[PDB]
Amino acid sequence: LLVEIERFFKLHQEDQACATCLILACSTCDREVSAWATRAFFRYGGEAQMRFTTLPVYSGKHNGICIYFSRIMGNIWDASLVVESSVPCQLLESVLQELKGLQEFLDRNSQFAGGEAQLSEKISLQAIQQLVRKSYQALALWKLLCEHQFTIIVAELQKELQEQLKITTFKDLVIRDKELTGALIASLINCYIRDNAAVDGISLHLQDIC
Amino acid sequence: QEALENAGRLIDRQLQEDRMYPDLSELLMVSSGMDMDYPLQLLSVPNLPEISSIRRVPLPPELVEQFGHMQCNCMMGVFPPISRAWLTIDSDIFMWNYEDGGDLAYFDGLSETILAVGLVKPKAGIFQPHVRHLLVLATPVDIV
Amino acid sequence: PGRSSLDNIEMAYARQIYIYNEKIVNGHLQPNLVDLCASVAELDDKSISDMWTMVKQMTDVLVRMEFVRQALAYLEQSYKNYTLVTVFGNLHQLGGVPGTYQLVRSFLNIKLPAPLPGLQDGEVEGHPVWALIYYCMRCGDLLAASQVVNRAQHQLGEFKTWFQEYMNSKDRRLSPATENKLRLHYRRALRNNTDPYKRAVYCIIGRCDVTDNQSEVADKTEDYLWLKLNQVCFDDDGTSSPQDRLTLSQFQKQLLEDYGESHFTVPFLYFQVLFLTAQFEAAVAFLFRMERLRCHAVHVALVLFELKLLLKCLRRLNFVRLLMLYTRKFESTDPREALQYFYFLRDEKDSQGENMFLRCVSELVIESREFDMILGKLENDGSRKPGVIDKFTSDTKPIINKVASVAENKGLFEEAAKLYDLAKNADKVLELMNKLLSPVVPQISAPQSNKERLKNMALSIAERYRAQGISANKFVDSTFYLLLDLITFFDEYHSGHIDRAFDIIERLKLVPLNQESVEERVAAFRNFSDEIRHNLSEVLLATMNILFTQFKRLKGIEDRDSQLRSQARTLITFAGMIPYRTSGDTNARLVQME
Amino acid sequence: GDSSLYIILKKLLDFILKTGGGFQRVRTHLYGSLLYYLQIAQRPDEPDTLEAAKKTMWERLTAPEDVFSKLQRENIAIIESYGAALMEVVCRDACDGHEIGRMLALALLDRIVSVDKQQQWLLYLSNSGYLKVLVDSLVEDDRTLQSLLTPQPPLLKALYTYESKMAFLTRVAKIQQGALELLRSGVIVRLAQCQVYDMRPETDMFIPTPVDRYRQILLPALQLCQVILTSSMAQHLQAAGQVLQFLISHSDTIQAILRCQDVSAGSLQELALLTGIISKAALPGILSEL
């Protein structure tokens, strides 16, 4: 439908079209024509045809992006993070990579989206973009943890707070519980576990957002 | 107000909506007549076509060769979990890798004609509960 | 007129950049400047040429890269070369050995210090010692000059001391000690009096009196520059708190005031002074003036650029823009050449410039619309045949999408199809393609030569893509084939072959040939894709035509007229059922009867 | 394409040669149109562009572009014919009438000048006319810079013309045949007669303005001399000897020029370079002064 996407729009709906459009744009091994067209649809919709907009609700763009985000994360979102980590390393890398692509995408075309229905759209999109980055950060930390000797520290560290820790969901990290992680991360650095470049990264992290 | 909480709320709401989606089958849906988008022609539904044929793999000739002589009975099938195909000619049975085709396994155990074969799950608690799948083979005389 | 003169020049210059780009790509050691120097020899360029030699001496003339030191060296070497040449030509052949000292004695003696010898020098044994020291110094032969002084027979001998340590150090002879003492002596004794060369040596070595100029022996403009360059003291100038510091900046400003291009006469020479003085920006701007030859300024800039200058379009210095604006002249006509020039922008390695380059190329592709040349062309499997840019490489897919979408705005179909092919959006290509072929099918007749256009385009793609691992949707391909079949029907419709046309039309399986199944043709009609739904009008009436002409009532046996008659009937019922969903020409009726 | 413009260009040449038009006013219009046309055809491009085009022709590897060269050739043919006729008319005219129309005709002459440099013109023009008149006018140039103050006003007229004259002279010097004609006309002599060089500018309106102006005249004349020198065979040739005499006779000015500042400095700087080029270009003025 890339050349006519009304048909998709009609059956599926605008929001879904936007979401798919976003995925095609990001999607890897795709022809430039396809990606550009999908980007164009996502950004501008169909010229003098279907318009892309907040009406005194949020535009399809917002819903499309959010739907995309929700669907990717849906499996992991509710599940408890720690049991060893609930999810395998390969999976962590997969999620991290995917979110990374999205993060870069939004970061690049943030100007269009951000900057009253219009303002509300601005706020909502800003919130989503922040969310994508935040998930990126959590996943990044986990990518780190996977490298090594995470399990031993976990067992020794956990105290009274522990019950709270164990029933922590991924979304809890997505919308962070800052203090515990900070303590844990500090232990990762203080102890030998983090190796080389990793360690530098946490110290950077603690400095930046801690 | 906080964007982060806000975003989380939006996704959760949407997730809920995704989960609520209507039940697939309802009598009311096609009580009068079924809506059908039905073309006789392949690829007739251009954009919409539900399925496409990615590839065709012929039975390897090496496998076929050991099926050349079959007086009594033939049969074949696919095992869904294995992603392997099986061929039975008389007494012998072959299993061949779907993806490979070069890789094939042969049963020499059976003395007699093979009436039926099947893939089954193991019992909850026997000595072989661990194994992923069991292969049941029935001949006239015995079940192995 | 016509001025093949420049175009020829344009091409010659373009040729050189082109070779330069080949070298950069091939990791070669091609010098840009030698190349210009070779061409520049011819004339008027005798200025521009000297400018190039100045730059070339700078080749790897970093060697660190001190502004005044190199300028000094160039001037000093030039003088030396001049000296060697004079010696290298008859005489005696000088009586003695070719040593540098003697060469200079020759210059002083033979050259114009004497018409027939004499006046106000200090001479011992037939030789002006001070002049000698001055010239040796001019040549850059400080050590020899020092030796001459040592041997001198003189009585300002304290100076002798101050010469040697000036020489010993980096040549910014800075003793925390005496320099002060030397200065006082200069003012009292030397300043109001003496032999011009002696004064020069004292002043220059000492940096004695910052008010600047040497009375009698400044004989050339370069002599003028060299003297000034000697005077400036860059290092540890800030340290020490006297205000006897003279800086490059100060020197540069004086050259600006009024001294002016006019003042540096040989305006010819002014260019060179600018380069030597470090006013690169001004130098390009100045080259920017006569005919500046925008071309010359551009290339010189390119040369400074290779040197790694440009360290932060008549008056627009930035390298990217200087190149870009140059391109404006030729870009439409010679897009390839434009690419070659834009590519130089990367020569300044660093981000910003890189993006500037990318943007420039992107800008070039857009609005020039030279897609085939710039982007690439025709697959025949075998991916793209590379465009000029691709040879340079990288971001090319994103540019294509951008261009292609734009093509869509304008509605420049063909360009879009072309662009999408490069994009490798096969499905998109066919779909746009079906649209193009689909209209132009419905219409009125008299067309379709058998060799080139949308139909021909249709044939190209199908043959081309379909055989090979076809990524397109089956549906999309199906409509494609139908459109092609209809087209072949057209070729054979007219040009005779009435019988053949019916056969093919029936094959389409669009129009009821059989019984009253005309209605099923109704049921399957609305279902029809938009592209075909549009085409049916001509399918009908083509049928009633061939049907008519073929079934011309014959003359005087088996003649089944009945068929090819029933066909019209079913067709008419068909047409009767959908006239509303058709353009509105049931003038099938006219052809129908007779 | 300014093809449509081409026809007007032809009409213009026709009228000029005819020299109909009681009004020089009319001819000034013709000169102006021709000037724009000549300028328009070659958008500012320099030898690099020409070299690139030649290479492309290189040879027609595939399909080349040689459009601008072809256009220049057509212009030059048209111009040639009409040319001899019209050169006569344009120069005579020059002088008089129209100190006004002058600004227009000298500019037309200079543009034309590049193109048709090379060739054609040198021969025709040579002869005549021009040279004689233009050299004599150098002498009078000096006198004209003084009269310059007065006429600041009549300045407007003449800046458009006097500068144009210097440019025309400089351009002729850039090529071998042109330089020869100027030199034959006795350039050095007129320059000696003008006495522009054989004096000191400082000796002597706000004074920096007059220095800028005087030095300005010196830079162009000095460029004309340097160009004539180099443009022949500057070596053993006669030209080298003439230039050396120029330097020695006007020595100390060269030396004096070497140091100081302002826009005046800028003009001074250019003058200094010009002398340096004269120096090395000849037998090294220094080399000669052994």
From Swiss-Prot, chain A:
The record's account of how the chain is modified after translation: Phosphorylated. Phosphorylation and dephosphorylation may be important for the function of NUP155 and may play a role in the reversible disassembly of the nuclear pore complex during mitosis.
Disulfide-linked positions: none
Subcellular location(s) per record: Nucleus, Nuclear pore complex; Nucleus membrane
Highest taxon above the source species: Eukaryota
Residues annotated as signal peptide: none
Tissue specificity note: Expressed in all tissues tested, including heart, brain, placenta, lung, liver, skeletal muscle, kidney and pancreas.
Role this protein plays: Essential component of nuclear pore complex. Could be essessential for embryogenesis. Nucleoporins may be involved both in binding and translocating proteins during nucleocytoplasmic transport.
Subunit composition and interactions: Interacts with GLE1. Able to form a heterotrimer with GLE1 and NUP42 in vitro. Forms a complex with NUP35, NUP93, NUP205 and lamin B.
Record disease entry: Atrial fibrillation, familial, 15: A familial form of atrial fibrillation, a common sustained cardiac rhythm disturbance. Atrial fibrillation is characterized by disorganized atrial electrical activity and ineffective atrial contraction promoting blood stasis in the atria and reduces ventricular filling. It can result in palpitations, syncope, thromboembolic stroke, and congestive heart failure.
Family designation: Belongs to the non-repetitive/WGA-negative nucleoporin family.
Protein name as annotated: Nuclear pore complex protein Nup155
Chain's gene name: NUP155
Swiss-Prot record, chain C:
Keywords: Disease variant, Membrane, mRNA transport, Nuclear pore complex, Nucleus, Phosphoprotein, Protein transport, Translocation, Transport
Outcome when changing R199W: In NPHS12; doesnt affect nuclear envelope localization; impairs nuclear pore complex assembly; doesn't abrogate interaction with NUP205; doesn't affect SMAD4 interaction; doesn't affect IPO7 interaction; impairs SMAD4 protein import into nucleus; impairs SMAD4 protein signal transduction
One term under GO cellular component: centrosome
Membrane topology recorded in Swiss-Prot or TrEMBL: Peripheral membrane protein
Main location: nucleus
Compartments reported by the entry: Nucleus membrane; Nucleus, Nuclear pore complex; Nucleus envelope
Domain of life: Eukaryota
Modified residues (Phosphoserine): S241
Residues that span the membrane, as ranges: none
Protein family membership: Belongs to the nucleoporin interacting component (NIC) family.
Subunit structure: Part of the nuclear pore complex (NPC). Component of the p62 complex, a complex composed of NUP62 and NUP54. Forms a complex with NUP35, NUP155, NUP205 and lamin B; the interaction with NUP35 is direct. Does not interact with TPR. Interacts with SMAD4 and IPO7; translocates SMAD4 to the nucleus through the NPC upon BMP7 stimulation resulting in activation of SMAD4 signaling. (Microbial infection) Interacts with SARS-CoV translation inhibitor nsp1; this interaction may disrupt nuclear pore function.
Function description: Plays a role in the nuclear pore complex (NPC) assembly and/or maintenance. May anchor nucleoporins, but not NUP153 and TPR, to the NPC. During renal development, regulates podocyte migration and proliferation through SMAD4 signaling.
Name this polypeptide is given: Nuclear pore complex protein Nup93
Organism encoding this protein: Homo sapiens (Human)
First and last residues shown, out of full length: 173 to 815 of 819
UniProtKB/Swiss-Prot annotation, chain D:
Compartment annotation: Nucleus membrane; Nucleus, Nuclear pore complex
Source organism, top-level taxon: Eukaryota
Cysteine pairs bridged by disulfides in the record: none
Tissue occurrence: Expressed in the testis.
Illness association: Nephrotic syndrome 13: A form of nephrotic syndrome, a renal disease clinically characterized by severe proteinuria, resulting in complications such as hypoalbuminemia, hyperlipidemia and edema. Kidney biopsies show non-specific histologic changes such as focal segmental glomerulosclerosis and diffuse mesangial proliferation. Some affected individuals have an inherited steroid-resistant form and progress to end-stage renal failure.
Recorded family membership: Belongs to the NUP186/NUP192/NUP205 family.
Role this protein plays: Plays a role in the nuclear pore complex (NPC) assembly and/or maintenance. May anchor NUP62 and other nucleoporins, but not NUP153 and TPR, to the NPC. In association with TMEM209, may be involved in nuclear transport of various nuclear proteins in addition to MYC.
Subunit structure: Part of the nuclear pore complex (NPC). Forms a complex with NUP35, NUP93, NUP155 and lamin B. Does not interact with TPR. Interacts with TMEM209 and MYC.
Protein name per UniProt: Nuclear pore complex protein Nup205
Organism: Homo sapiens (Human)
Gene: NUP205
Residues of the full protein shown: 1392 to 1692 of 2012
